[model samples]
Target chain A: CTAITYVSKDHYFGRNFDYEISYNEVVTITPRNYKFSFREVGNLDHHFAIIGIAAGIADYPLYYDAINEKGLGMAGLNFSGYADYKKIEEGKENVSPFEFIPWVLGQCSTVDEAKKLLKNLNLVNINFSDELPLSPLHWLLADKEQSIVVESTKEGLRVFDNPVGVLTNNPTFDYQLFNLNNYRVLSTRTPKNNFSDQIELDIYSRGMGGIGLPGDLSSVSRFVKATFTKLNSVSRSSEYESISQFFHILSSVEQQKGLCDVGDEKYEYTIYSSCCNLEKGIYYYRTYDNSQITAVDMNKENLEKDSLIVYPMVETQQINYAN
Target chain B: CTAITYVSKDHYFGRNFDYEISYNEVVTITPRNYKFSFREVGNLDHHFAIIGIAAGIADYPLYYDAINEKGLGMAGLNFSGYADYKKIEEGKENVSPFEFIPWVLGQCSTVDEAKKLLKNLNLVNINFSDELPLSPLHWLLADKEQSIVVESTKEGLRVFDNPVGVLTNNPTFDYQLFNLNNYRVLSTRTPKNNFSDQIELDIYSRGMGGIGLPGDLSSVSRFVKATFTKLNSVSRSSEYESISQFFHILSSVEQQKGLCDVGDEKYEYTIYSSCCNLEKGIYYYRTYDNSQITAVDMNKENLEKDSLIVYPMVETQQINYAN
Candidate 1:
């Protein structure tokens, strides 16, 4: 679950949600009117508007991804074998895994605010039910000014500036960034052939410079691909075009239907792709069954209401005809 | 041009022909007969039956790939910018690039025989026409016993044993083999996390063992991916199942539409995929337009007559529906 990033246009953030199963999520647009409170922090007045991709299973929206009205976007992607959280202690600001996004987005307006809030965070062991296990996750937070990745490894919670604006599931965020060193030799320019001195050989085709880029579906490979795609991508001034381009960048590393099997006939595929245009407060997304882009504007919703406004995603595949 | 392989069933061979434009090639089945001669070695009788994928523009079949009745197969893939052939030299057995396959397949039944012919061989500068330049290519030859790569680099003709039994375009065969060392740490089993000792993290999903497989369309990445895919692929006993498995393995690294751009609004894609079942002496193939497997047996043709039987590939896309 990755390729999270912040583009140039007003904190535009996008990512691909990869999982073993399609959760059939919907866009849950929660306004600021809720008399909501964190279990650890108690009741706090809803001070900000929130919109997120959620599975309608709990009383509160379970967001895999979300953005606030403050032009802040945050997503919790699979950290797995590297994510480590803190145990709840008395006097510390304890938050459950389910409350992490709400707490951060409800109180923070930027990466600066998010960081301040994270300092006092105690990620307590809490669950919606006894059956559902906590998801191993690291978060990608981005504002108009900058982006950062928050990863809680065994060493402790570490917040790192995302210079590459990309995140994927783990050996850990730092390790992924360090792995970039291996590809320092890669470039977009054609390579010089120094194979033999006696005769000249033919240059076969374009893209010889990208000869070493990882081409597998692994998280590290996806991270490199995403970084390279974003860096090499042609940015457009048009918002629609930029959004489309962002999705295309995500598509470069998106897993196909039958490629990743996790045994027992279960396969891991890109369930949905999301891009949040934070400046516009518009959330755009697409599901595995649907390639057509769909958007839900937070400003269009009842921002004053206390209830969550949910929009069901069109999961069925649709074919658009030009004729 | 891509995807070279050796199947377990009597050393079957296969590969995909990927290019910017269709060569409009046909499968040509040739039989032993009458008088035959090489531009370098004159007036030799055809002694073997051969089946090959050819584009018949010249009087002799211009095979992109071929297999003889002796279970020996050879394919010329895009070497481009790296393939260097010699000029016609006195006393050296000179053969035009197009005649390389016919000479080897016509006279040699094993790698030993092919090696002997190759020793005195000279790749002369010849072309089908002024408009049609000779394609820069390297050859992959494999019999039931072994596989080897032949490249006419700047230093002269260099042949190397292929321990990996795989080949892709560009960067030379040696460079690709050496590149495999970079991925020696990759595995198909789950990786043990050694990052921290303080806490345990969740193992997100299966296939974490393949965390570093290259996932790009570049030649080097494809070479590594092909090697990994083939090494990790599950083998079956049935011929059809095995052939299907081979094609599936190719599909893992096969280029999709819109990925490879060659300038001028032109894109490169796998035009066709072929697998020669060396044991059964059957050639199986599929085109980009039609992924359905099609086959022709070498034994089914007239093996005693000096003639070529051609089978046109079904380029039209096909759809199968159940009532």
Candidate 2:
């Protein structure tokens, strides 16, 4: 899975939820009155109204990703082996992987506020239920102003400023950032020939300026490519164009079927992609079988209601053919 | 420049001439009677007829690439700084860089035959004329079965058996091959869970298996990507599909304008791509603006003629628009 932040006149945050099977996910909107209770951290009777894609089990909203009315967005990506959660701690805000998104997105409306909340937080070794395993994960938190990566490894919880505003799975965030040095020569403009002065070689094709950019689905390569594409991308400030460009950035690393084989006949593919309007309360998305962008505005919902608003993902391929 | 070998039922060889300027290159057919006079080695009054892309300067077919009637193919790629030529040698076949393609293609039909001929061969430090500077280059030679790289440096003339059957302008052939070690993990099949078993992560996208494949235009990255694509590529036995696949292999690394800026606001691009039918006497090519494949069969011309047969490249974009 890859997540990135894009800015036009208005900033946008989104992620590609890549995996073989969907956990029966839906566009879930948790209203201001939606009860918030953590297994370890104390309860919040009233907080920010959150809207994002999630798995609703036992009447609880287990968000894989979300954005509050305050325009703060957060998504959990598979960190797997590198991510380490701890036993319940004394004074720290012990949050489970399932509850981590809600905990961060609910009370704190900004990354700076979340940073202070995370100062005493610990990712506890607890699953949503006994049936679910302790899934290894990390979170990408961003607002219109800035972005940061929150990871709880073996050492401790660490928050690093995301200068590039992009994240992918595996290999630590530090190593991913350091790997960018290998591709520092990448540019939107064609690089001047360093091969030879006497040769007078020609620029034979377009997009050759992106010659050093990685074009693979690997975690490491995606990190470099996403960083390159997002950083060099240019688009108009219009809402439609900006949102379209944001999806294009995620599509740069969008996983297709038959590429990743886990074990059985099944293959891993991007289940869905989501984009949040950080200034407005819109959560936009498209599923694997669907290409059309679906929008669910949290502002349209009655935030004072205690009931959870839900919209099943439109997974069918959306097409318009003209004769 | 990127060069690759593609094998269907019949093995094919080709290269992309990626440079900003065209030196009036023509599809040149050198008949058997065309005399070959080496600046150092003695003349060949008669040899095998050859056909390839070349610059017809001073009535000499300065072949950038070519194939003989006996099915041997060869191409010269820019080696620049690393390529070093030597002073005259007493007991060796002293050949200048400009005379390299003709001298070898005229006499050798197979890589093994070329290997025997190169045992006592010396690349002498001499230019085509005092006017043209000595361009640094290395050669890729192949027949129906095998391929080899011939490079001349300060160390002396060295020949390496090309296991990957792909070559590009480089740091060196040795370093280029060594770089493949970094991509040994790349596969046409998506890699099984090495991330972690606990997460059960989904294969989010197709082509994730090729995640580690480099998608850049640098000589080093191009070498690796081309090798992977060719080695893993599948094609039908038909002539059309085989040649198409061959061109696709070269296209995988085709340099475009605006990506490789040479200087003076000019960008380097793929001026042309050429594919030689090693089993037959066909020399095919496509120009920068013209994508339609153009064929010049050596067997169709008078092989006994002493004069050089030249066909100026069709430089216009040929479009078949369905109206």
Candidate 3:
């Protein structure tokens, strides 16, 4: 139910490809509430991200979602208020939240490999800082055809197979699919039967009456519509149409500011980065204030010392550039 | 396939809908080296012009598609090279192809109505102008939702359903849908199983390979993609975003001149138009020449003629009332 700010830029890497990098400042009304922020890197081939969660207690980094130097892509999702996690009782070695992004990006090439690595590692919540109510979150991993929505609910982290490859916003994926029913069916051609004669004589009628209906910008609606729209569209025939449709759909998920009421403190922004490689690192980012865009290409040699930092909505602020 | 052009000033008769009075020119090209031109007039509902041919001659004015008074629409497909038609007989009615647009738009309200009318109508093609050798053609018809492709082969005239709700040139309707599968599956997000391992590989390697994409002006690709993109898109959401996405997809379908060597002879143009009966009988067109946009609204009625003729395409284009 919380709205976040989205600011992103469109970056070009190859003549036909691009990498978009973005900082999702997940804001919360409660000062001590959990917000998920991370650097999502992606391109047409693969999309992956390394995330850092900010809270009063555990101010650590974790693997949000990513695809490695191969073609895998992944992202973390909200798993708080439901999913459960406890720090390893006596573990001596552990990865920090700040280390998750690069860590995940380093491990897997395909989505399957990422899933395998996750299965081997036990994700335990550690009491690193004085923060309260650990920013509980899960993740979503996707490929060119399918996706997995992992929710670390109070019960435990659960993964759902998302056959409809569309993802956006929050509030359990199931709820969004269910909400899609409120809107009319979508297809390239018009529907065979419309509201006019379906035994109608009123301003509003049956299911057909919802024709030309306008859906809210709720996560559920966005998820359902976005997923179905992409699923139903004839696959892109060229790189231009493919990428153009990609960003446009992402834009559809954007939440407008000012529409939020007083108590709504969440910010809105967009991630314009794209990742094409699962191994050799390439990260892209564009900010609302800084349109120049920044690109980061990582190799095993120096990625350990690098941090893809965000500069204050200004000009290009590079963290590390190897020429 | 042959391309036809229809330009009309539509009228609304007390009804809450706008009716079209059209003047059209149809140019026909046959594989057997027969070509000719004809003209006619009709409304959105007057479909099924009597072609008057007992055999080869009767298939002339194939009414495959048309936009109607209520803003309802229709279009048909022609596949004569591979199919058959009745043999030509002397003394048959020579229906001009230009008459088909209005004829189809006039009779049908829903797709079902159009379908049934097409079945019952005695559509026979006949000779017109005594040009050259006799040739044959087929058609595809659409209302808002459904479209049907009619084939008049040597055996007989048969109809097929266009499920994608859109149609384009080349390869039969069946071939297009079958080919859609190859591309549709590619556009989807990848499977989780492949996300890891090959993390460094390109995500778009095979998803968009070799799909002879249409440029901004290609009638076939534009028609198909536009039909699918907007139809599949979350309908009527935030006006700005929806409209923006629609234009982007449509633009992708456009084939800029010279980009693709679709010889001038193979070039076909399909224009998308929207009529707002609510806005002072205004009609808007984004043509191949300048999709920059142009609007025309019927302003003053020709009192002496007791009919409406003048429309507003620009401020000066408006009839002067002050004088």
Candidate 4:
């Protein structure tokens, strides 16, 4: 998975949820007054209205990603060999992987607030049910003001301010962040031939400026490809242009089938892509088989209600070809 | 510039002519009776018919790239700081840089024939004229049977069998070919968790197999990116599918605007992309502004004519928007 934050006329945040299988995820809205019961902690009956795409099971929402009414965006990408959830620690806020998004999105409305909230928290390894196991994961949190990553490993719950508003799986977030130093020469503009003057060199190709950008589909490559694209991309300040550009940003690294075979002929691809107009509450998404945009507005729903509003994702190939 | 050879239902060969400036080049044909005038060697009045994109000046065809009617193809890519053409060598067939393509394509029809022709040649440094200077370049030649790169530098003329069937600018052909050892781990299928087992890892994404392929626009970077794409790409054995797949192979690294600013607000872009059906004698090309393919068949023209036939490139974008 890959997540990023983009700012235009209205702030935008989103990601490419890439995997070989789907958990039957949907666009889910948790309105205010819907209780968020955190295991090993007290329940919160009143909280910020939240909207995201997630797997809803037994009346519980396991958000792969979400944004609150206050423009706070967060996403969990596969952390794999690094995410180390601790056991319930006394005197600390113990939150399961399933409840982490709601626990943060429910109470905190900004990245600063979430950063402060992590000081005494333990990301506990608890499954939603016996049938469903917990997958090691780490989080990318972004508000309009700032973006940050909160990752818990054997070292402990660590938060780092993200200079580039992007995140992928892991070699650990800090190493990924440090990896940028290696690509300092990369740019959006072409550089004069520095190879040598002994023989004349033509810019031959336009994109010779970014002669070192990684084009692979690895965690590190995704981090660089997304970060380079998001930082260098320009966009118009219109709502549709910003929304459309934001989708293009995510699609830059969207995994296609046949490119990534996991095993047994099962390939991993972008199951769905999403972008939320962070300040406006318009959550837009498109599935693998579908390229047409489908959106849901949290502002249009009854935010004061206590029940969860669920809209199934449109996962079919929808075309509007004119004949 | 990038050049590659792909074999599907037919042997295919082509390249991307990326530059900021256009030389008013056209899809040109050099018939069998079109006398060749070499600066150092004697003229060949009757030779193989040739077709390629070139600059026809004062009745002379300076082929940037071309192929013979006998199924052999060759392209010249910017060699820049490495192509060191020596002074005329005694007893050797001294060929000027500007006449290199015709010197080979005009008389030779296969790699073995070309290879033998190169053994007694000196790549002499001679200008065609003061107005039209030479650009340092190396050549990639492919026949239906094999592929080879002929690069002349300070060490003298060198030739190597191109196992990967791809080439880009610079770093010398040997070094570029040797650089493949650095990316042995890259693949088209996902590998298991080699990072560590300290925590569970997910294939999370496909194409993670090619984690280290370079995506930059630099010579070395384009080499790896093109090599990786060509080696891993698969295509159906049909004219449209093979040609379409070959286009996609070149486009995997096609340069776009705004991404590479050379200077003075001018940017370098893919001026044109081309692919030839090696065995059929058909040359297909798409210009920067025009994506609709325009092809000129060698069989359809007078291959034995003494005059040069030229077709001006379509530089305007053509769209058929149905409403």
Candidate 5:
């Protein structure tokens, strides 16, 4: 139900030597009444983008983050179980995925700008915006420097800084924080070794011990374990293994079937990427399948004119050379 | 690092029975330190008892629950990372484990009373009660009727009603609750009917497509799965299979080392017991050498005696006419 990919510290995957890793998840919406699609939209700020993939009765994917041809990226981390929400202003609604992109891009140049601008904007659940029936969900926004978890629950829209750096599917940003207890200690970036010296011998002899670190893909445990591993991981010095190990820990929280029965319910999936890590400008991905890594190169200038289709399981031409 | 035992439903080794499970960790503490054991202690009444595992600064078996020769049944749930202690009143200073048991059992007749009396008692750390020098641990307590969860974090003693009626070792009781989210919908009583439903459609079908669950022994995941299955279990009226299924689920949570080298400092053994559904009793067990079942039957006159130890893994003890 979860897909994770890693880039080892020194390993190079593409020609220009770009570094990128992605942890992707296919989130099964609650109430199971909606369908979604991620169609290649266009380019903005030199990045190729895709329309949101979730919609249900009068509620669409409320202008989540996406990547444009220029390598600008964005995301929407889910935070429903915990978040405050309010109604959209009258006569103020942008339902088309078409309108949402340029609107967001034109209003903000940087992730921080986008965040600040979004603070006052109320995303309405219009039928064209939403697919059919609105399934309550939230998101995390990420561009380059940082990410933010956004929640729109029964209460309303609330945001929290993504301290752990990476975000996955979730009940809420805070639910993940609260669930951090399951992992004992959670971190990202590098392993925090300030607390105990006893574990030094353990880690040296074995890999990760002392803590019964989670190996499943639940939103809370994954966020916590990933955060802790990032904080405590000693491999951040190398871009390769840090990303590789990051993927390993993220994958550890996957919810695999066959061990038990879930009937019609589908487990959550994971997606991973390291913003600005790709010097060669290649973004890698693995769909629902845990294996099979694929990449989209960003070597040429004006990538939008290329018109090469990058997503949707099958290949197509969408990203045309922008020149 | 954990153990469990069970008595099956139909009196078969795998059919009808009772079960118990535990976790063991090695934490370093000061010499002669008292290891504090807290259980939800016993249900709504807030029965909290702290027992001593003795501090030799050595590894000693701390019983989560034990029955004395006098037919007195006791269990210590855990309160690690969460055990809190306030400075005793100026006049009040020390408390001993020996004093702990009698004090808890003297006035409290049921799990409920234990929960109440322990509320005011200033449980000073006589010799400084803490997780073992290398083992951070807690306890869960139960008799015939009720079960309790006791947490011993940095905060003082906080007793909780073991609403789920089960306990396991790990990141504290709350974490267990959080992790349970994964398998909260599982049913343990019967796989037969569902299997039948599938078989009805296609006679020889196997390996469910949408029902697979986790098979690892991680406490958080296992507890969640077990609790889910237990919660959804419809075998309440079907005693024998219910117990067997319970054991099977508990076994699923067990982690066995020595299987292709689970690395150093791994789970070496497991003990599962039955909280006698039909009759009132405790099954003392050691999974490694003694899968042998020791039945300590309650409700009998002159029950102040060594209970029968069943043999060959199955069948009951021959009634001894003598003593």
Candidate 6:
């Protein structure tokens, strides 16, 4: 359903989010003025600055990915079948599943703050539209300090420290974490044979180091790939260097047009890739058609205002010709 | 490394080969003249018509893949660190690693014949050039009777009955076969949740059945994926239908252009895919640039002649524009 990775090193933190979907989603940036109140909890005068990627045509835009001024970034990937939101309660902080990004990004500035907020959260069973059932989801929340995964299962909400710095859909974050044990033997150097002294064998090729890494489009594979890419990648100090490198890691697992078939003559592919630099408070993104990196700065927008400033993504691919 | 699958139904045997390479390979086909011989083996009076994809600038045309008029097909993918060729012995059917394909394809018409030839065979360690070390390799041979994997290990030359009908590089064919045991739980139908009667859960996704299939480009992952794809693919009777389906199976695991990095700024990808219909005696292939399938028919050429017929593959991508 999605691939997300966090790169933190040398006082720099960059996270990449790949939104994979069956249809082309026209994505836009929304600066939120959270007069946020849900159900019985009347409007709290407390509001926070937030920016996120939202789809068109809706009264309340569902932010699949976003970051708040507190340097916290959050993204929700599909967790269908296993994602079970709590039923409506008589007295609880009841929030619909779709409101998670804004609910968290609007209130919490750090993973610690998010963790505290999640303690009382009732991710209630609520649908965005009659046609589109409740979109099953799990979220990755990250700040400059750390990152965590939030998943609502039948057993209620569970949070796990994302030590792998990567998340993909389904099978739960726990299952994905345990799956890393399967690849514990993988190395970045050429693998050596355990042949006895009686036999003489020469290493004739490259990549013996990565003999068993999973290489498919499934969520499990993407999780492993993202982890391997993030772990092996070189960490640079500059935002430009780090952001570009983050995109390269994302592209390693990105779905091309014709690979995945979703029946009824449809195919699933990556619609867009976004990276948020928590330290710089810059949200960078590119569409399926565009390769150029575009940025939306949280600091540039008026945080004191009560309206959202939209920056529509440039979808057309453009090539630069030297004069 | 590479992945290949075989589908046989109603007398049509189709095999698809995905040539996964560390760099983009410029491949060409060379027809054979059995009158030609290598090393000390002069002509052996065994003559057969054959065609194969050969790489460039080597004294020995590296036939990574090939097929003969006798309805037998073979491909040598990267076996790397684990591949161990026999040291030249005083008395044995000595053959260089590079000569194994032509030596087998030039002599055998069926899997039985190949198996017999394998009995006394010695894949000697002989290098084509000092620049290019002995390219570690293992071979997969298939005819109407069955498919078999030929591996030269430190132990000796070993052949295994390939019930799975799939092959990729490293860890030995035995290990790959045994690894399939890990995925015995995988199924093609939608997976049912193990929820107790007290809890009601609905299957919400299309590919739940493939929950744990390894999806990495590693040799092991490719082996599991190829096996899953080949087993689940719908079998069709027509050659066209079977061939197209075979390509789809290969395409499922085909490496995209930018995913695999082989260092030095190079990327690994599926350079081409090939399918051989043993019954029809035709070799069909498509390049990474050009997906239009081109075929070379064994029946069209003079099989009895000593000269080899060559059909150069067209690498240019072409698009048809409608008025």
Say which candidate scores most in TM-score. 4
Candidate 2 positional error at B212, Å:
2.4
TM-score of 6: 0.56
Judged by DockQ cut-offs, the docking class of candidate 2 is incorrect
Reference-based lDDT, each prediction? 0.75, 0.79, 0.34, 0.81, 0.36, 0.65
lDDT of 2 by residue, A193-279 (tens): 998888888653344567657766678787887787677665568776577667656756766544455668665667888888999
DockQ for all models: 0.10, 0.11, 0.02, 0.18, 0.01, 0.07
> Which portions of model 4 miss their true places by more than 4 Å?
A1-185, A188-212, A226-259, A263-323, B56-58, B197-199
Model 6 interface Cα RMSD in Å: 10.7
The per-candidate TM-score of the B chain, in the order shown, comes to 0.95, 0.98, 0.54, 0.97, 0.55, 0.90
Fnat of the models, one by one? 0.18, 0.24, 0.00, 0.36, 0.00, 0.09
lDDT of 4 at B56: 67
Deviation (Å) of B59 in candidate 5: 44
What is the C-alpha lDDT profile of model 1 across B201-282, one tens digit per residue?
A: 6665555667777666777777887788777655445665466557656765666444565667565667778888887778
Model 1 CAPRI rating:
incorrect
By DockQ: ranked, best first: 4, 2, 1, 6, 3, 5
Candidate 6's residue-wise lDDT over B237-281, tens digit each?
666656655665675565544345565655565667777777766
- What TM-score, to 2 decimals, does candidate 2 have? 0.57
For model 1, chain A alone compared with the true chain A gives a TM-score of: 0.95
For model 1, the local distance difference test gives: 0.75
Candidate 2 lDDT at A280 equals 90
- Reference-based TM-score, model 5: 0.38
lDDT of 1 by residue, A1-323 (tens): 77566464545787888887766587888789786667778765766898889877666788898999998888998876777666778887888877888888887999998888888777777775686678888889998888899877778778899898888887777788899989887655556667777888655555666776776777877888778767765544566556755766776677654456676765676788888898888888766655446778889878999888888886543322111
Provide chain B's TM-score, model 6: 0.90
Residues A1-323, candidate 3: write the lDDT tens digits: 11111111221111111112234432111111122333232211223333221121223333233334343455554433544664553432233334443445454555566566555344456445556444555455654444566554455445677655545545566765667666545433324445456574432111221133222333454454344434433222333333333333343333222111122333222323232222333433332222122334333223223233221222222111101
Top candidate, metric lDDT: 4
Checking candidate 4 for backbone clashes, the offending pairs are A260-B206, A260-B207
**Per-residue lDDT for B1-323 in model 3, tens only?**
22211111221111000011112222111111112233322222212211110112234433233343333444333333543434333443223333444454444555577666556333345434476333344455544344566655555556678665444444455666675664342221222335578567432211122123221222334344344443333212432233233333333333222122223323222223222222133233332222222333322222123211222111111111110
